[PDB]
Amino acid sequence: VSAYLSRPSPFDLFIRKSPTITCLVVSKGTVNLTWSRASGKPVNHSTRKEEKQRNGTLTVTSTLPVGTRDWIEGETYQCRVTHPPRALMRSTTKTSGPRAAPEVYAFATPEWPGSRDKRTLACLIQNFMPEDISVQWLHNEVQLPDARHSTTQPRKTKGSGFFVFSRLEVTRAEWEQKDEFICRAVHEAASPSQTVQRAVSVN
Amino acid sequence: VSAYLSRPSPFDLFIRKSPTITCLVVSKGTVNLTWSRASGKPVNHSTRKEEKQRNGTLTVTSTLPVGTRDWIEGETYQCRVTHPPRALMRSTTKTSGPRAAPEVYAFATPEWPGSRDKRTLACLIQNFMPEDISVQWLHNEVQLPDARHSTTQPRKTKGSGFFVFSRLEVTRAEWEQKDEFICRAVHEAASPSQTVQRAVSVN
């Protein structure tokens, strides 16, 4: 039995404003999962979901809604796991360290022979701290689904900042209907509104 | 006590032609580390190195030179670990699955205010199988050191291929001495010579 405690994505924190943290908690007595926060304030209505999957293992995850203002002042949220000798606990909180806003760069790949109806849009986001970064792709002023793009895990630059790449394949029908795509980065150091953007097109 | 068995980088296999595999093997009796291969051919002179590091742990890694031709015909190499009840064993071999050569794209970031002496060169390598991919950056026809660049871990595309990004910061002194940089990908499906390239410049 092992457990993990997630952080709120910058997208959930500053765009949706409805951030949440989820206690993963990956068998005779059902396992109880409760929440606590360092300030002593009450825990919101935490919704717990039990999943019977898959290879002879049980998954019980609890999602706890948190407040965006609370997370900024350094509120520590702790999750505890009890079974019918000792309990396991994970604690999540705002990352420490300096803040650095991201630089955002967008590029389009040239036409590749045989694949004329598809293109690849690449977004470089770099020199930001801390590493927590959300990426969304906008087309027609409407955000594209998340499954459409792929973002690499943050990695350290030669400086103290982190960088991330985002890759998005687009179809001809899309860029011909409107040849403009926006790669948006959500980071708490971005000012104002925690957003840095760049537009790209396919020629 | 846990152990890992590495694969030979495509760079070591097809460029250097001197590939090697290393048995990581991360305390009263010294641990013996021996090698074996499925064909029954003898194991080359395997050099073993013992490192006393760091937080009350011992590291003993053995590097085994392998032949480039052998790895292509599917030779399986196995590493076994014995302590003065049972032994641990890892086995490495050529990856299975279809082969797809990589597409390579190189881009340069525009000037960022305040950082006029530096630039960021980005290389997108995508749609290749299997995932094993080496990346090197060439400037002045001489390969740059590896610590200079950073390559993301392979990730799956919406198709069956993988993609990878490579990031390289360059200085003004470099591009002014010669404003041409080559991003080279080493992959066994690349033909011929297992290499796909693209050049980029800073304007």
Added chain:
Amino acid sequence: EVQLVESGGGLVQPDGSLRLSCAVSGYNITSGYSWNWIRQTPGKGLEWVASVTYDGSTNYNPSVKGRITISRDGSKNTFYLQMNSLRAEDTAVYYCAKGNNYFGHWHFAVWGQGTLVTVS
């Protein structure tokens, strides 16, 4: 970050009354966490005195209950400790400390410099 600065300590006569203050900076005491008073007799052990939470709830150590009281001033971001009927047992260094909650049980994460109260 949170910094606690005590004041109001000094020489005091038995049966008197003294008021100690803790000036908090970097965090508003009405926002959360517990805010406690813990005294130490020099050369001896440490004892918890009283606590006020961010909601105004007060909790006292029964060994001092009835003579002592803990107050809060949100506008000045300061909480106080009023002592009455001083005794030689009350001579001690008085620290204020911020309390972090762990499932209904508090620990003293940040402590002030402490101010000395001496009765004769």
Added chain:
Amino acid sequence: GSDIQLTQSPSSLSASVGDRVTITCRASKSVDSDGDSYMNWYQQKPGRAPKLLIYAASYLESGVPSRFSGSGSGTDFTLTISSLQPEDFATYYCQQSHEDPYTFGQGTKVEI
């Protein structure tokens, strides 16, 4: 009188840099509850205020060196230091957060 009383051992000890030190804390009543033990450990160097090293008996406060470790349960708790350092010459107190009023040990003084 009805309080939980905390007794530490040893009261004082002399050590050298690099030594491993073990301090014990005994409680009148069990401070265990809900699968956790509400015993906290504090370090107090001379002339300064106490500092939190561990809470819940095993968890380390952010910024505390890894050499400090807590163990125990019920009425038996142990603060362990893997290797002693010059800045560790201080008095070490345990504190139970199970019942009001919160109480402290007498303190273990470590002299280098």
